[PDB]
Each structure stands twice: as C-alpha cells, then as structure tokens.
mmCIF file of N, CA, C and O in Angstrom:
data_model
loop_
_atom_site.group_PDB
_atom_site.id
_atom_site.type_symbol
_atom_site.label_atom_id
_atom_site.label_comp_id
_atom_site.label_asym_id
_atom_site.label_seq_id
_atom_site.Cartn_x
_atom_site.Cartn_y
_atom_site.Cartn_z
ATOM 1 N N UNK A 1 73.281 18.745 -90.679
ATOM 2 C CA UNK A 1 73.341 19.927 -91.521
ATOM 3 C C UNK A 1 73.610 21.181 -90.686
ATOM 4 O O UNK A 1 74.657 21.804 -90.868
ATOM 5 N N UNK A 2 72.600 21.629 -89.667
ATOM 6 C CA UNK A 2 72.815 22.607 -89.150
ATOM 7 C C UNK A 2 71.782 22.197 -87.716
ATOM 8 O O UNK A 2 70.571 21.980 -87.668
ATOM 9 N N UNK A 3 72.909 22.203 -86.543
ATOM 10 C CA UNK A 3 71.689 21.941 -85.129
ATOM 11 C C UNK A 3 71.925 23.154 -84.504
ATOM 12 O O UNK A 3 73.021 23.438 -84.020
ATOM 13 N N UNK A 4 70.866 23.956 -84.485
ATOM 14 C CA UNK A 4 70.444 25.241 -83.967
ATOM 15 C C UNK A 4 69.118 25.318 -83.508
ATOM 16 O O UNK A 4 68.459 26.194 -84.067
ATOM 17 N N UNK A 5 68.499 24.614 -82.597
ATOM 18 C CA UNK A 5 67.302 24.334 -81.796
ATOM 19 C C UNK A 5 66.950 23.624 -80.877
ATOM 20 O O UNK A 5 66.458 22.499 -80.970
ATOM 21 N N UNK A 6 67.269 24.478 -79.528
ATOM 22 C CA UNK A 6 67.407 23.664 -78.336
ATOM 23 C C UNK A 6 67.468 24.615 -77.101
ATOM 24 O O UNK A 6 68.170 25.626 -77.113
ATOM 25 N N UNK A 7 66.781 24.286 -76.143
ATOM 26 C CA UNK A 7 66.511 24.652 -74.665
ATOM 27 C C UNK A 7 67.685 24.363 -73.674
ATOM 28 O O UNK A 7 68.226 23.266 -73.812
ATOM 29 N N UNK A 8 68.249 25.356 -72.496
ATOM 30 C CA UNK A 8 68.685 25.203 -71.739
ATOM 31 C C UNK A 8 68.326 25.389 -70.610
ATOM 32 O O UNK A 8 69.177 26.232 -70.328
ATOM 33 N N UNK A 9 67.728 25.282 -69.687
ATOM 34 C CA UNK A 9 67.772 26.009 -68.155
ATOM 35 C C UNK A 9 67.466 24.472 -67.214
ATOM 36 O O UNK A 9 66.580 23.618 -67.165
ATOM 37 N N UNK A 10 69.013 24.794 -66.428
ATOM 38 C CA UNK A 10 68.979 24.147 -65.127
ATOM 39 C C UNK A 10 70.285 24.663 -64.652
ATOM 40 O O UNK A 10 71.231 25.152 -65.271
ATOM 41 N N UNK A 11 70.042 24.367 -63.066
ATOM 42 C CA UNK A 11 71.045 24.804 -62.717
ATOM 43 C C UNK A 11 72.378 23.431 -61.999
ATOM 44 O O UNK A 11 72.373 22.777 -60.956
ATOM 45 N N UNK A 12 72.976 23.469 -62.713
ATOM 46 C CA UNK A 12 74.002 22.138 -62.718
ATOM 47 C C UNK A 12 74.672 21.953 -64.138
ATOM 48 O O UNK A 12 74.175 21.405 -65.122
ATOM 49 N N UNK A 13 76.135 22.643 -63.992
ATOM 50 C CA UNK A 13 76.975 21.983 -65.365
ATOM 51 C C UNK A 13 77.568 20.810 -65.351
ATOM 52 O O UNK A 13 78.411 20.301 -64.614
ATOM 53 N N UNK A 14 76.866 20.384 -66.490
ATOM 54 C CA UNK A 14 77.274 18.964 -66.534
ATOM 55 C C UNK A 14 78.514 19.007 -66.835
ATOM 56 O O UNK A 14 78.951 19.771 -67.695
ATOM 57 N N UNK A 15 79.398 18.005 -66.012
ATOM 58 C CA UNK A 15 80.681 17.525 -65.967
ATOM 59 C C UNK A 15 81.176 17.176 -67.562
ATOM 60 O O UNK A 15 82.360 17.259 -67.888
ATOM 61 N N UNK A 16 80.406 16.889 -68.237
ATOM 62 C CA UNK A 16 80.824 16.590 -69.692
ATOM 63 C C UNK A 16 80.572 17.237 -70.962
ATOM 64 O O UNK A 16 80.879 16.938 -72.116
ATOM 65 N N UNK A 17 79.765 18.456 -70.317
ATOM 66 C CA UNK A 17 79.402 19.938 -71.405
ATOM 67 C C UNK A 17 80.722 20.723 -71.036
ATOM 68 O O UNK A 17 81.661 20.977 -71.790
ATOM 69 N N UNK A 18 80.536 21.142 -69.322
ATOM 70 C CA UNK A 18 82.214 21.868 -69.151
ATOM 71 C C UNK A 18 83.130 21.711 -70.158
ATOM 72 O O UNK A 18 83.442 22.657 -70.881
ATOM 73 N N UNK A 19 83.801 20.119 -70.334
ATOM 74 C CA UNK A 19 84.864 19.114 -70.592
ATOM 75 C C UNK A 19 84.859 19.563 -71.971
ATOM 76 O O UNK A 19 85.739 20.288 -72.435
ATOM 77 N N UNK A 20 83.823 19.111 -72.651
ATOM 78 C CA UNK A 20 83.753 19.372 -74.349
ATOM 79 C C UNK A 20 84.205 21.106 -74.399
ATOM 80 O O UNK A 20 85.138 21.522 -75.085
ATOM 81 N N UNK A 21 83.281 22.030 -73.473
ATOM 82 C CA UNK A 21 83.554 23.234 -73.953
ATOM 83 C C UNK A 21 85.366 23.622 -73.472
ATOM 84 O O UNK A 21 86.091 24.461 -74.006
ATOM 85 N N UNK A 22 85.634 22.892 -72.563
ATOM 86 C CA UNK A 22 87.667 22.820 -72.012
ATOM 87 C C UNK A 22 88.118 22.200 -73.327
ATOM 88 O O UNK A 22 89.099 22.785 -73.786
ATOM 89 N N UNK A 23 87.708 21.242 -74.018
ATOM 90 C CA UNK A 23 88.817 20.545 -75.385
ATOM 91 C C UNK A 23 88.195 21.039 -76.629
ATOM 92 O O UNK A 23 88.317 20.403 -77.675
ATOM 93 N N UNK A 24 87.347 22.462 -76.543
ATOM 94 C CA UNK A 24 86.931 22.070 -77.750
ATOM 95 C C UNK A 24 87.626 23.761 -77.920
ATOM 96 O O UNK A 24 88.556 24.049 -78.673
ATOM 97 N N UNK A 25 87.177 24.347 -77.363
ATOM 98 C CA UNK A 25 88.647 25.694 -77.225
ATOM 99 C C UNK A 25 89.322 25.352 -77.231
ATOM 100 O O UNK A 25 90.112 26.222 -77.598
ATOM 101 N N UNK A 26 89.881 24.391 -77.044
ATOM 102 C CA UNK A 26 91.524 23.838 -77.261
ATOM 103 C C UNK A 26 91.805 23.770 -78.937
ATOM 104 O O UNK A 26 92.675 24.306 -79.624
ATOM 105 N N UNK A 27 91.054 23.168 -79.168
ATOM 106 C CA UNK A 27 91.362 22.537 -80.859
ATOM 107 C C UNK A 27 90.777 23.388 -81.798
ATOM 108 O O UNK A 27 91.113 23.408 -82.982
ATOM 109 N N UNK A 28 89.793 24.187 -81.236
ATOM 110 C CA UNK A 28 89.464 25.857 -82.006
ATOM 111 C C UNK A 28 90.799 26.316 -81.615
ATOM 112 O O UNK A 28 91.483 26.496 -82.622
ATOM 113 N N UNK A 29 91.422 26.571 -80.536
ATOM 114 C CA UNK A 29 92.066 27.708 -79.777
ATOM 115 C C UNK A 29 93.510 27.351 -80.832
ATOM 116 O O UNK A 29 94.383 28.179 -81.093
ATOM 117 N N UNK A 30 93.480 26.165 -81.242
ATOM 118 C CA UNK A 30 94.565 25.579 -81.667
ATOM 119 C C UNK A 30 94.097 25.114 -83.708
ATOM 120 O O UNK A 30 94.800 24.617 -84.588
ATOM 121 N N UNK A 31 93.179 25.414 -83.711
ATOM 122 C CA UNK A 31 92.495 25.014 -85.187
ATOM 123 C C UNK A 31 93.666 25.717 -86.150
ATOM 124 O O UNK A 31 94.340 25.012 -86.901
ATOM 125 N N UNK A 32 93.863 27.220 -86.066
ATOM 126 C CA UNK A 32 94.268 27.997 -86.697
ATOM 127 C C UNK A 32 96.339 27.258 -86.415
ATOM 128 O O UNK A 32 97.016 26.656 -87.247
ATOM 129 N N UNK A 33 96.653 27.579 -85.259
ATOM 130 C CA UNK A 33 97.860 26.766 -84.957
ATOM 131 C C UNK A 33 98.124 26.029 -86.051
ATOM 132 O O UNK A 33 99.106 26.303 -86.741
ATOM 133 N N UNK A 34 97.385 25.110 -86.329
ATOM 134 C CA UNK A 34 97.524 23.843 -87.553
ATOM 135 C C UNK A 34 97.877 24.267 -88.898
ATOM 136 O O UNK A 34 98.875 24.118 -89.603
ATOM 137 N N UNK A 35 96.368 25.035 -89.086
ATOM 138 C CA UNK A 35 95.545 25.115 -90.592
ATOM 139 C C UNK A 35 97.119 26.425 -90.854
ATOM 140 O O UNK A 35 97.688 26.282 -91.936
ATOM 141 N N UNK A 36 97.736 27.638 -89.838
ATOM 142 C CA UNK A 36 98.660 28.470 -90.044
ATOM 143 C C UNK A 36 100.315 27.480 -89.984
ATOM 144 O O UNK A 36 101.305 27.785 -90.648
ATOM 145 N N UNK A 37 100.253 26.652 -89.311
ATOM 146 C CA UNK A 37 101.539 25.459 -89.156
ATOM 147 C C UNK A 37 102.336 25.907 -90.445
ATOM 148 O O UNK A 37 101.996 26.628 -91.383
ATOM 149 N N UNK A 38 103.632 25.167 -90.144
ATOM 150 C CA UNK A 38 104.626 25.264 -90.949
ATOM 151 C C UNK A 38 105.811 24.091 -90.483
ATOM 152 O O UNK A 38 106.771 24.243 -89.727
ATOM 153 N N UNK A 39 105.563 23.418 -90.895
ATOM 154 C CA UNK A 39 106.766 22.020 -90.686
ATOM 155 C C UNK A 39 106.175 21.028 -90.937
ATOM 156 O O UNK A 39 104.973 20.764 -90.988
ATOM 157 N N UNK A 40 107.603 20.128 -91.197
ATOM 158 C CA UNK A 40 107.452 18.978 -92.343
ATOM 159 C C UNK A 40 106.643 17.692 -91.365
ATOM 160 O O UNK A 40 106.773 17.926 -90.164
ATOM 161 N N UNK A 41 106.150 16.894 -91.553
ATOM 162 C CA UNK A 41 106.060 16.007 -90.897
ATOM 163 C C UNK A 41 106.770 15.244 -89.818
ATOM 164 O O UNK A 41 107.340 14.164 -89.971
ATOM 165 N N UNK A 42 106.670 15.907 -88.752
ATOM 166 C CA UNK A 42 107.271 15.035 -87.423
ATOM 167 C C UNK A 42 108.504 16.607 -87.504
ATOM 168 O O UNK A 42 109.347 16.204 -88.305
ATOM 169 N N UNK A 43 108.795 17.587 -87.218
ATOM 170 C CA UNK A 43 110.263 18.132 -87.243
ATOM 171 C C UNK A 43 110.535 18.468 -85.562
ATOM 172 O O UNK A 43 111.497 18.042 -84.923
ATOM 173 N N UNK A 44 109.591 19.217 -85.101
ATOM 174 C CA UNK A 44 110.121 19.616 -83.739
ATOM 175 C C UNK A 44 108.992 20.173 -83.132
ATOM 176 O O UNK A 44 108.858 20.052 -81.914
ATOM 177 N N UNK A 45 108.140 20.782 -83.819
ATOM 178 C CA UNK A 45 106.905 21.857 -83.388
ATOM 179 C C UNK A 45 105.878 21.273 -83.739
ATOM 180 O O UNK A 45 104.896 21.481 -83.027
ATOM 181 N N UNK A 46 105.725 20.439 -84.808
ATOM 182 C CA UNK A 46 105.112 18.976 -85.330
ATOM 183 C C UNK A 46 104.288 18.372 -83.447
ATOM 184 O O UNK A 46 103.201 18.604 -82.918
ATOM 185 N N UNK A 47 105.107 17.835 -83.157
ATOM 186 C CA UNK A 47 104.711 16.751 -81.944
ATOM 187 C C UNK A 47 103.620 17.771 -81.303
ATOM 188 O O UNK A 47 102.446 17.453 -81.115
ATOM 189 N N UNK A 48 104.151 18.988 -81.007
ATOM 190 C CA UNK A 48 103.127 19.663 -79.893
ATOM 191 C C UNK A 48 101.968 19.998 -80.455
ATOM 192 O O UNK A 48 100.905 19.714 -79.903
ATOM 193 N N UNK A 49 102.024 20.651 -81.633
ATOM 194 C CA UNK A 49 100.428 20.601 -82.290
ATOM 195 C C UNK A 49 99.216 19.431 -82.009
ATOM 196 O O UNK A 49 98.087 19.620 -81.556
ATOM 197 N N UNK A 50 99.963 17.942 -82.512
ATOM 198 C CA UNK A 50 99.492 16.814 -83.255
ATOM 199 C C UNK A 50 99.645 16.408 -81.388
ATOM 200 O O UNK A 50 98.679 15.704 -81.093
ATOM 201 N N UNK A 51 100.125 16.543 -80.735
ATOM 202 C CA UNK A 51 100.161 16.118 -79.156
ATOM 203 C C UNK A 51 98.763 16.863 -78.762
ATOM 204 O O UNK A 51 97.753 16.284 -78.360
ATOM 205 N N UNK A 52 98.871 17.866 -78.904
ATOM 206 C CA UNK A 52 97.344 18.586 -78.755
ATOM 207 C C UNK A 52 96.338 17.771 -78.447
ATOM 208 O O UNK A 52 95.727 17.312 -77.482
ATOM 209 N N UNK A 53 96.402 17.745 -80.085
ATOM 210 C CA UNK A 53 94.680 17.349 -80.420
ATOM 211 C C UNK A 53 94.576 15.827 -80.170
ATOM 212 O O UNK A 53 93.469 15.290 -80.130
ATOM 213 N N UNK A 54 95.895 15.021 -79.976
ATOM 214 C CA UNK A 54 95.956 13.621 -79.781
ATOM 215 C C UNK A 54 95.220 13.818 -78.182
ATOM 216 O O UNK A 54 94.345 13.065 -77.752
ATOM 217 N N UNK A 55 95.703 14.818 -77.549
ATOM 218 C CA UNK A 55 95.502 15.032 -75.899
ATOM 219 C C UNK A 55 93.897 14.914 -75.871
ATOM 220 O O UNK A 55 93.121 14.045 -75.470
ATOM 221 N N UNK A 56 93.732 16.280 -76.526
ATOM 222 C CA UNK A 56 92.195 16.860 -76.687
ATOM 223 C C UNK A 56 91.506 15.194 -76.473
ATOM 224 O O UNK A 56 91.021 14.503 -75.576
ATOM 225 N N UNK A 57 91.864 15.101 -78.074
ATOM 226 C CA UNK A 57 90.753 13.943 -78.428
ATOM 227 C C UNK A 57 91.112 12.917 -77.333
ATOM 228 O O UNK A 57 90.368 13.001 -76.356
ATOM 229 N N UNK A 58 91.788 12.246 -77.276
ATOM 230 C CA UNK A 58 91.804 11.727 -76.066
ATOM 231 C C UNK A 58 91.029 11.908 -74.889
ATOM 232 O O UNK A 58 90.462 10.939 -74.383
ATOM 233 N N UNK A 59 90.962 12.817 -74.499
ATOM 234 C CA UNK A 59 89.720 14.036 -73.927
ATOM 235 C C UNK A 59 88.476 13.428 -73.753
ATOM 236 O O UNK A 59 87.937 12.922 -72.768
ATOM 237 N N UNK A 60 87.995 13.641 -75.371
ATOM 238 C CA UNK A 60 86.783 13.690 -75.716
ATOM 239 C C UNK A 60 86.138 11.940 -75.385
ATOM 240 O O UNK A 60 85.068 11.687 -74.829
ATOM 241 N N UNK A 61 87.114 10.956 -75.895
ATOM 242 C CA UNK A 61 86.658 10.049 -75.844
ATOM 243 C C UNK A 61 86.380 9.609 -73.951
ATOM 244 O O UNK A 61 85.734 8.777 -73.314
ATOM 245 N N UNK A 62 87.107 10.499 -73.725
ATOM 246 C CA UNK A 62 87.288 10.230 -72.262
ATOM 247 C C UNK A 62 85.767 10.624 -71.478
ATOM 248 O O UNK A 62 85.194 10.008 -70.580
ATOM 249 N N UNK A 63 85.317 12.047 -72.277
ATOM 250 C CA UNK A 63 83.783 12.665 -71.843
ATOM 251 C C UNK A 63 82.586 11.460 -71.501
ATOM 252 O O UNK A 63 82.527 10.495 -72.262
ATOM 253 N N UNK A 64 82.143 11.504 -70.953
ATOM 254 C CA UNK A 64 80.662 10.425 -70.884
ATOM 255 C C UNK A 64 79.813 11.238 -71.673
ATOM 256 O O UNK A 64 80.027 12.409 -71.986
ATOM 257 N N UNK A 65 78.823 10.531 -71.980
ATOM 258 C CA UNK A 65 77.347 10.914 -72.628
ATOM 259 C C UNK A 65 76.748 10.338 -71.569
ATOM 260 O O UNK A 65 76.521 11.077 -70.611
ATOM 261 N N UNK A 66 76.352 8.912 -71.479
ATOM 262 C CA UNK A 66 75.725 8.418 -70.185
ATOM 263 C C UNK A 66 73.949 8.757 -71.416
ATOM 264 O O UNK A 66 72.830 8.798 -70.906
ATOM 265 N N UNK A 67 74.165 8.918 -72.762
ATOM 266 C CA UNK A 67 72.701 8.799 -73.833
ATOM 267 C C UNK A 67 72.452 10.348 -73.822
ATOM 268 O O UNK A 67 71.272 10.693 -73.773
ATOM 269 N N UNK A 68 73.238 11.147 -73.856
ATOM 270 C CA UNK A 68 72.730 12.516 -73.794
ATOM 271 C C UNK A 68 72.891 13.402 -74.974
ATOM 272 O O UNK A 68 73.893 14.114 -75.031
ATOM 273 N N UNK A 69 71.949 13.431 -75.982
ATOM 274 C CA UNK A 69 72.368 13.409 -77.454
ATOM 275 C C UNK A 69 73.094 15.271 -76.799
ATOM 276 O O UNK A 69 74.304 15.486 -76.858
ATOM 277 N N UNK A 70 72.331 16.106 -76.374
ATOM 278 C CA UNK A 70 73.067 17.542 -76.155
ATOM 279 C C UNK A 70 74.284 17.043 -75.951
ATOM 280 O O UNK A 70 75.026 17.831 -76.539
ATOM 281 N N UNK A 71 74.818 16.355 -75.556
ATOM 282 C CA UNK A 71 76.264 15.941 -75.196
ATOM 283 C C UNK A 71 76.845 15.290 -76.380
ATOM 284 O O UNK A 71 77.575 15.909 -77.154
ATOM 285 N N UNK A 72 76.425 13.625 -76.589
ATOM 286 C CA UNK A 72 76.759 13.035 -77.329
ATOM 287 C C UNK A 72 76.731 13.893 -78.408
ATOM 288 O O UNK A 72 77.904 14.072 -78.736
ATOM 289 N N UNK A 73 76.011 14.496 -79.106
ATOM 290 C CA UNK A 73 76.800 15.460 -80.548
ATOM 291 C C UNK A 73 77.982 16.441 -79.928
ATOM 292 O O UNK A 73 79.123 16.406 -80.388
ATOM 293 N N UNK A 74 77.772 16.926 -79.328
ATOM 294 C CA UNK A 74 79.152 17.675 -78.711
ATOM 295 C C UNK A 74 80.293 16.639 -79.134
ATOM 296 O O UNK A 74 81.076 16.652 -80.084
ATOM 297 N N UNK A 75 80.098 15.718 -78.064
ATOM 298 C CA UNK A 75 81.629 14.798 -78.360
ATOM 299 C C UNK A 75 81.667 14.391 -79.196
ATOM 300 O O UNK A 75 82.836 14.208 -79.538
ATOM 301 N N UNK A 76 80.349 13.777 -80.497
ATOM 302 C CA UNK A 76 81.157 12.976 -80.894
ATOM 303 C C UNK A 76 81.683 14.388 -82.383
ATOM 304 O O UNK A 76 82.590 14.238 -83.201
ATOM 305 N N UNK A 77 80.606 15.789 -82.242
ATOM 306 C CA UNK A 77 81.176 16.464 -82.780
ATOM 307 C C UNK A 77 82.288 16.868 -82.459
ATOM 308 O O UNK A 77 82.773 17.465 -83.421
ATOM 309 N N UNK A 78 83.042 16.857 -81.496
ATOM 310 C CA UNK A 78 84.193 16.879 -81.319
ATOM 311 C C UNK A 78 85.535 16.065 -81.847
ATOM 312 O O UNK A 78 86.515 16.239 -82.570
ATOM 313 N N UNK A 79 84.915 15.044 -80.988
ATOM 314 C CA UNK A 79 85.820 13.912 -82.009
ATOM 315 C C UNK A 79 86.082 13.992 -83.517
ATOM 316 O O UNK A 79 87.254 13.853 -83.867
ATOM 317 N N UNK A 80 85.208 14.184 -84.396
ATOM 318 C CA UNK A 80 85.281 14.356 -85.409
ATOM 319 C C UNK A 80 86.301 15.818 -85.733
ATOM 320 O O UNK A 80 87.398 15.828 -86.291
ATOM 321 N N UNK A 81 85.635 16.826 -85.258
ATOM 322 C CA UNK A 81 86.545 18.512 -85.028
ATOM 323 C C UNK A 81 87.996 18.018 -84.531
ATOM 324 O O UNK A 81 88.884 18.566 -85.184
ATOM 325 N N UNK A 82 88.435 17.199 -83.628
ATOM 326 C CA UNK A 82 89.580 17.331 -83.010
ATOM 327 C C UNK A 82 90.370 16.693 -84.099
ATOM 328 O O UNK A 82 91.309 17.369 -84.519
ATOM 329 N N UNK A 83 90.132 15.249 -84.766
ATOM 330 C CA UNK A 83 90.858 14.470 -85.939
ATOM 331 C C UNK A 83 91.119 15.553 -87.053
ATOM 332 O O UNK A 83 92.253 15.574 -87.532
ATOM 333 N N UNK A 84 90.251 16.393 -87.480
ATOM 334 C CA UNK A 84 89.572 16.817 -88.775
ATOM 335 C C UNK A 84 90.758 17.452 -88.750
ATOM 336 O O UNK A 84 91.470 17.133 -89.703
ATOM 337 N N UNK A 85 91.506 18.686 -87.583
ATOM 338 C CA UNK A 85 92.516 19.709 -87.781
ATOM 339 C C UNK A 85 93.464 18.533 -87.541
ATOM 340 O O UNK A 85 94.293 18.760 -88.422
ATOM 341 N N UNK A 86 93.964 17.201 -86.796
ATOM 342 C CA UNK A 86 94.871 16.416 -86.968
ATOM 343 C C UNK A 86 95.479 16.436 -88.552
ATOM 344 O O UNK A 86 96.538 16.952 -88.909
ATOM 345 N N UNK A 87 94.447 15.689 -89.428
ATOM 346 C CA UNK A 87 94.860 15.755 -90.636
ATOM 347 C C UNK A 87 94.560 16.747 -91.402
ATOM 348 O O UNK A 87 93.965 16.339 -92.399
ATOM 349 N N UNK A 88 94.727 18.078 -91.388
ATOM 350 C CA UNK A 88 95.028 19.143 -91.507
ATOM 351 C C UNK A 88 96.914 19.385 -91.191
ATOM 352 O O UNK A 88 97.904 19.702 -91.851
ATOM 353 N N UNK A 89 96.684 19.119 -90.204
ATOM 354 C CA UNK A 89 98.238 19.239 -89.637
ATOM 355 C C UNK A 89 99.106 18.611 -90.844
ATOM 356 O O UNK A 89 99.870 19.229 -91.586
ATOM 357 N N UNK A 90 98.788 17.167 -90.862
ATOM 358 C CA UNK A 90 99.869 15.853 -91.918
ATOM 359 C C UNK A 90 99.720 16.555 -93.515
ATOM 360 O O UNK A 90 100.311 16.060 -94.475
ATOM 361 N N UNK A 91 98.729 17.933 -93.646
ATOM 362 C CA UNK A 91 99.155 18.501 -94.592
ATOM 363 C C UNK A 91 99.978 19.844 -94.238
ATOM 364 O O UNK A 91 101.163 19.959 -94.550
ATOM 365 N N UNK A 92 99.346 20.727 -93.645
ATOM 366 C CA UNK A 92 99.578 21.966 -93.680
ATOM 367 C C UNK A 92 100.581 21.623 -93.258
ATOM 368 O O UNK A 92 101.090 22.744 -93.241
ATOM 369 N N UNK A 93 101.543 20.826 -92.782
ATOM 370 C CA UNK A 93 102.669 20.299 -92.667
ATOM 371 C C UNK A 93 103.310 20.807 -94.054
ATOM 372 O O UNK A 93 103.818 21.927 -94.091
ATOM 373 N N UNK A 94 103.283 19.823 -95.413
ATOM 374 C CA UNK A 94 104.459 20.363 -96.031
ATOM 375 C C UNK A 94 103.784 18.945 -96.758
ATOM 376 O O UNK A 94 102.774 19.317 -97.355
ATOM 377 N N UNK A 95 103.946 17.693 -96.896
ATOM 378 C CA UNK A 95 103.835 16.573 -96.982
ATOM 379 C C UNK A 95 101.914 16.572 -97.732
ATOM 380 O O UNK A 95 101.080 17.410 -97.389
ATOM 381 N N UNK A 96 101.736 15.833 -98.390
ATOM 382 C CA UNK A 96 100.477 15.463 -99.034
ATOM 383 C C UNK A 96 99.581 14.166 -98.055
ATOM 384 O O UNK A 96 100.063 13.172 -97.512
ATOM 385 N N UNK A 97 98.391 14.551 -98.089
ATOM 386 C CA UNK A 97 97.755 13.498 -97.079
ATOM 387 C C UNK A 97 97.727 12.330 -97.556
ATOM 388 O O UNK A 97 97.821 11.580 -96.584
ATOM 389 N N UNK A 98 97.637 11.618 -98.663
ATOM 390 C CA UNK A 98 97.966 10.638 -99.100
ATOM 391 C C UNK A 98 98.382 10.359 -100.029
ATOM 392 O O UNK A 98 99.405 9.688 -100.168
ATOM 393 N N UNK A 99 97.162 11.148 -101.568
ATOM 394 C CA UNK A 99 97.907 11.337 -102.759
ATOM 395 C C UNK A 99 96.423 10.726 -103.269
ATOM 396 O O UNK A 99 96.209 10.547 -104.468
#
C-alpha cells in the first residue's frame, strides 16, 4: 500500500541500492518519455524508449538482494516500475494493448 517506515545509518552503499537508484532514474527519467511518446508500434524512436527500459530492467534483474527486503522491494519494485511504463509505451504508442 504505502512503505514509508524505515531506518538508515551506515556507512557503506550498497552496490545494489546505488544500482536500483542508477535504473530507477532511468525509467522515472524516462517514465514521462513513454507516457509523452508518439509512434506507432516499432517505427524508429519506438526501439530506444522500449530499449531503455528492456536495458533498465535487465538491470534490475541483474541487482542482487542476497534477502534484503530494503533492497528486494526496490528491485522487485522496480521490476514491476520498469515493465509497467514498457506497456505504457505498446500504448501511448498509437496501437491498443490488447483489446
């Protein structure tokens, strides 16, 4: 629903908080890119969007948790965030997501 309760202090960034916060500005940085998009499915400007977040997510799955729910919701909130503007794209494209 809403996770807003939680402690931070140490000194060491974890290699896989960095990572999430590097792909997850990406697919924010790029959210709007999509949801503002304009082209049909697959035309030319198509690939680099949908290359993105294919990258990103790719990314994400790539992140470790290693059981670290502060993490593991990151990624797998990510994962979920990075697909979510994917199919966004296969609309805001032009084209209907399935019907």
């Amino acid at each position: 629903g809403s996770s807003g309760s939680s402690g931070m202090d140490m000194g060491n960034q974890h290699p896989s908080i960095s990572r999430l916060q590097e792909i997850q500005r990406e697919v924010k940085a790029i959210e709007p890119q999509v949801v503002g998009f304009s082209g049909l499915s697959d035309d030319k400007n198509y690939k680099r969007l949908e290359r993105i977040l294919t990258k990103q997510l790719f990314e994400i799955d790539s992140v470790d948790t290693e059981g670290k729910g502060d993490i593991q919701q990151a990624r797998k909130r990510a994962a979920q965030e990075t697909e979510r503007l994917l199919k966004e794209l296969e609309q805001n494209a032009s084209g209907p997501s399935s019907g």
